[PDB]
Each structure stands twice: as C-alpha cells, then as structure tokens.
Design a binder for this molecule. Structure first.
Ligand SMILES: OC[C@H]1O[C@@H](O[C@H]2[C@H](O)[C@@H](O)[C@@H](O[C@H]3[C@H](O)[C@@H](O)[C@@H](O[C@H]4[C@H](O)[C@@H](O)[C@@H](O)O[C@@H]4CO)O[C@@H]3CO)O[C@@H]2CO)[C@H](O)[C@H](O)[C@@H]1O
Length: 388
C-alpha cells in the first residue's frame, strides 16, 4: 500500500512547468490514495530554500528536483535519504554513466537521474541566411559572421549571457582550460587558458559581435533572441519550448542549433541536468521512493521528451522511435555524449560564484582577464583545502 502526501518541489521553468505538474499528478492514477502536492520553486532560490527547510526540518519537500551538483551538496550535510536497496532504484543500469555519477556521494546513491543536458549555439536561420553567413564553428568565425549580420540585417550576432557563470565554461574549454584536475587535486582555472577565456568574452562584447547584461540575464537573453535583436545565443534544451512560443520560431522551423563555438585550442560544453532526491526527514519515504521510480521511469522520460524535448538519462528511451526521431534530440544527444563532466564533490556547486563575480567585472572593465583568472584560482584554493 501507498498512501499519504508526497510534496514535490520542481525547479522547471515557465515553459516546462505545466508538463511537469501533469506528470507528477499522474502518479495518482496508479496510486489514488497518494496526494501529490506539486510546488514550483524558482531555480535561483531552490538550493537555499531546500537547505533552509531541511535544516529546520520545517516544510521540506518529500521529493526534490535536484541539480546534478546539488546531490553532493545536500548529501554531504545529511539532507538526503540513501536510495540503495529501496524501490526508488529500478533498472538503474539503463542510465547514462555520467548521469549516474552525479547521483553518488561517498559510495552511496542519493538520487535518480531525470534529464541530462549541455549548452549549444542556437541560431535564427532566416537572419543567418539574409546575412549570407554559415553557422560559425569557432569564435573567430562568430566574430566574422556577427559583422556581416550587423552590416546586412542590423541585428547583433550574439547574446552573450553575462550574469550566469555556467556560460563561461564553453569559452574556458575552447581556450584549452578546465576548473580543476580532479585526479591530481590541482586547481587549473588560473592557467593561461582562464586568462584567454576572460579575454575572449570581453572582446566579443567590446567588438560589438555580442551584447550582454549584468542582471536579469535569462529574460534578457530570451527576449533578445525572440525579438530578433540577436541572431544567436548559447542555451540548453530547457529553452526549446520557450523559444518556440515566440512568433519568430513557431514549430522551430526557423530555429537552428549547433555546437558551441571552438576557441583557440579546441571546443567543449559542460554536462548539466537534474536528478530526483528524497528528503532524509520525509514522513512518507515509501510513497516518495515510488514517486521517484515513477518520475524517472522510461515511460515518463519518454513523455518529457515528447512534450518538451528534454533529454532522457535512460539509454533505452533513445531506442523509442518517438525519441530517436526528434531533431532537437538527434543534435543534443551527441553533444551530451561529448560534454565535459565535472568533479562530483560537495564543493562543486560553490565553484560557480567566483566565476560569476570575476566574469561580471571583466565584462564591465573593472578587472583585467589576468587578474580575473588569478582571483578565480585563489577562490578555488580557499574552497578546496586539499587542492594545490
Ligand atoms: O551548483 C548549484 C548552485 O550554483 C549554481 O548552479 C550551477 C549548476 O551547478 C550548473 O550545473 C549549471 O546549472 C544549469 C543546469 O544544469 C541546467 O539544466 C539549466 O537549468 C535550468 C533547468 O534546466 C530548467 O528546468 C529550470 O530549472 O531553469 C534552470 C535555469 O535556467 O541551466 C543551469 C544554469 O543556468 O549552472 C549553474 C550556475 O548558474 C547557481 O548559482 C544556483 O544558485 C545553484 O544553487
């Protein structure tokens, strides 16, 4: 028997949330004595809100949509129920290895994978065609393309997200860099690749190839792309249905997607995504395990793709013709296969704030690329006491 309340905190965005609420409530079809209480929690607030609730054992959710870096974060402070040997885990081996890695902390499973993602270059096909340019493969090509776009159409080439540090990573990887060398416990962000990456973002804006904003970056990016103010943006699968709501991208026929541009050394995009965790203090652990199994099942992952084009973590789901033949999936899955995995460490989540501050200050001209890289390195060494 399953009965009682399962409160689910979902972080999905305005375009995704109706789908996720319907899926969550569908758990009640097979378990009518369970009451699913769906709550949508803003992404930026959710980590803090969960810690506040879990630390005061006061209004915590039973099931938490848990960003890949939040698993080790929450788990290290005891907020997550261990899932090994529980009904929450079913056909575990189906999940992509890199998705499974993010669910683990100190030899225990604290989450089940839900979606996997990476960043890509979205582009407005009509604008590029009008400008007579090809989708750019590199930053150098992007600069050239942007000039032609402005000359021939008046649009700016790129919206460069300046207020979210995750958007720094493609530039860092393209310059031949990474945050840390996990295996050797060495901070690497302040290597010359870090300097180069901060210089690249500043040059893109100064040269007018790109525009940016120091605040409200999600809305500003989406607005600029949807309104044709820019021809390109870097974004993820969570943006697809949001973009398609716009007059300019109905049915996605005008929406192109390609890999993030290479830099001077090579090319790369980060691995991200979401898992599902159970609050350690839940008063309905059984019903929660079953809710997690349900939300992470092949059936529900397939539905999510069909409604939202989010990428399944289950390998088996990619063999479903409906998923295999989805064009956003056909592009994003290979890109995900190549995505750079991060260290799944308690402090991994905290690696982002230092980038955020230095990136803002580079873009405004308050901080040189050289100082920004050094500052980011210093911040990491403070965070990671056993890293050189
Ligand atoms: O570490 C967590 C805290 O720090 C910052 O989070 C990071 C995060 O660890 C990174 O992996 C990356 O998160 C991205 C995520 O993986 C993507 O899926 C995407 O998230 C969107 C969801 O897909 C969508 O459903 C809805 O929830 O909106 C999300 C946001 O658009 O994009 C994420 C990046 O925006 O990057 C962030 C750094 O921003 C962050 O500071 C938080 O406060 C975390 O607590």
């Amino acid at each position: 028997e399953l009965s009682g309340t399962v409160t689910f905190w979902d972080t999905s965005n305005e375009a995704e949330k109706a789908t996720y609420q319907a899926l969550a409530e569908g758990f009640e079809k097979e378990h009518p004595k369970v009451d699913v209480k769906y709550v949508n929690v803003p992404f930026g607030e959710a980590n803090a809100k969960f810690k506040n609730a879990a630390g005061g054992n006061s209004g915590a959710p039973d099931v938490m949509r848990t960003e890949v870096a939040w698993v080790a974060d929450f788990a290290s402070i005891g907020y997550l129920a261990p899932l090994d040997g529980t009904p929450a885990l079913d056909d575990g081996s189906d999940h992509l290895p890199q998705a499974a890695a993010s669910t683990r902390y100190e030899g225990k499973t604290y989450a089940v994978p839900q979606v996997i993602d990476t960043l890509a270059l979205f582009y407005n096909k009509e604008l590029l065609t009008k400008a007579g340019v090809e989708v750019p493969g590199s930053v150098a090509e992007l600069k050239t393309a942007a000039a032609e776009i402005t000359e021939k159409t008046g649009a700016t080439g790129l919206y460069l997200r300046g207020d979210d540090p995750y958007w720094f990573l493609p530039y860092l990887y393209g310059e031949g860099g990474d945050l840390v060398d996990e295996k050797n416990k060495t901070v690497t962000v302040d290597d010359e690749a870090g300097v180069r990456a901060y210089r690249v973002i500043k040059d893109l804006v100064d040269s007018k190839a790109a525009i940016t904003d120091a605040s409200d970056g999600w809305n500003n990016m989406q607005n600029a792309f949807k309104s044709g103010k820019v021809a390109m943006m870097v974004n993820g699968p969570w943006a697809i249905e949001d973009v398609k709501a716009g007059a300019r991208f109905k049915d996605a026929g005008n929406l192109g997607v390609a890999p993030v541009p290479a830099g001077s050394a090579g090319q790369g995009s980060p691995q991200g995504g979401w898992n599902l965790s159970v609050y350690a203090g839940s008063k309905n652990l059984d019903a929660s395990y079953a809710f997690v199994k349900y939300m992470s099942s092949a059936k529900v992952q397939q539905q999510t793709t069909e409604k939202l084009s989010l990428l399944p973590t289950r390998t088996s789901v990619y063999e479903v013709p409906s998923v295999a033949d989805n064009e956003m999936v056909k592009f994003f899955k290979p890109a995900v296969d190549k995505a750079v995995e991060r260290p799944w460490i308690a402090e991994g989540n905290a690696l982002f704030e230092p980038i955020r501050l230095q990136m803002a200050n580079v873009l405004s001209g308050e901080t040189s690329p050289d100082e920004a890289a050094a500052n980011t390195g210093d911040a990491y060494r403070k965070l990671l006491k056993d890293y050189k």
